[PDB]
Amino acid sequence: SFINYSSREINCKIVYYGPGLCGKTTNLQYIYNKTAAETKGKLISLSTETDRTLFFDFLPLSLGEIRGFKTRFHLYTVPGQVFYDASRKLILKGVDGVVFVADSQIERMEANMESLENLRINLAEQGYDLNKIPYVIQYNKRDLPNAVTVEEMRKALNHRNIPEYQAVAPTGVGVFDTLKAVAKLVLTELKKG
Ligand SMILES: Nc1nc2c(ncn2[C@@H]2O[C@H](COP(=O)(O)OP(=O)(O)OP(O)(O)=S)[C@@H](O)[C@H]2O)c(=O)[nH]1
Ligand SMILES: [Mg+2]
């Protein structure tokens, strides 16, 4: 987080992580579409001249408040396909909370596990610890006939029983619940230290 004690402004960063095509961008699109105009900024895509179609997303929002400050949450996604580790590492810098978006399709379980381990490693490689940071897991794509059962998703991907939400990101199932859960965890940490 960045706290400016003179201007009384706090900026928090939430990163949506997970394997290729798992639903990260779709989460932010639904959040943008369904949030009141007065509490959201603009959802934008970003890429660079070096790889102009390697897109990730940025969306600023007003969620909860810390008394005596203006607090804004900046939501980011990452490029989840395996090759793009360097991009994921750039985006994770300064993260305050993480949402791991798992693709419930059975064919994508290995990719879910690879991406979750990559999250843990990348957090360690910038001095963070996944076990301590505000962190919520989303089991997305619950609508698909090849989705793994929720119990099996939990046993495979949520060994520490952190908060978990079923989702269908394009229709909004679970999307705001996931966001509000991680944002509350981040705010609680701000109020602590
Ligand atoms: N059936 C179904 N399709 C979904 C769901 N969530 C996302 N999708 C679809 O999956 C595809 C990829 O979603 P997207 O949100 O773009 O992935 P991403 O995680 O951002 O992917 P990347 O940028 O790391 S490669 C899209 O076609 C989107 O509509 C879901 O819950 N159910
Ligand atoms: Mg995307």
Numbering used by the authors: 2 to 194
Copy the relevant paper text.
A hallmark of all motile M. xanthus cells is the accumulation of MglA-GTP at the leading pole where it activates motility, while MglA-GDP is found diffusely in the cytosol. This localization pattern arises due to the GAP activity of MglB, which is located at the lagging pole where it inactivates MglA-GTP and depletes it from this pole. The ability of MglA to hydrolyze GTP is essential for motility regulation. To gain insight into the structural landscape of M. xanthus MglA, we determined the crystal structures of MglA in different nucleotide states, which uncovered that MglA can adopt three conformations: inactive MglA-GDP, active MglA-GTPγS, whose structure had not been determined before, and an unusual conformation combining inactive and active features.
The structure of unbound MglA-GTP is currently unknown, leaving open the question of whether the substantial remodeling at switch 1 and switch 2 is solely due to GTP or is promoted by MglB. Binding of GTPγS induces a twisted three-residue register shift of switch 1 and remodels switch 2 to create space for the γ-phosphate, as seen in MglA in the T. thermophilus MglA-MglB complex. The shift of switch 1 results in the elongation of the arginine finger loop (residues 44−58), but Arg53 remains outside the nucleotide-binding site. Displacement of switch 2 also allows Mg2+ to bind with an incomplete coordination that lacks the conserved Mg2+-binding threonine (Thr54) located in the arginine finger loop. Accordingly, the MglB-sensitive MglA-GTP species is likely represented by the MglA-GTPγS structure, in which both switch regions are in active conformations similar to those seen in the MglA/MglB complex (this study, 12).
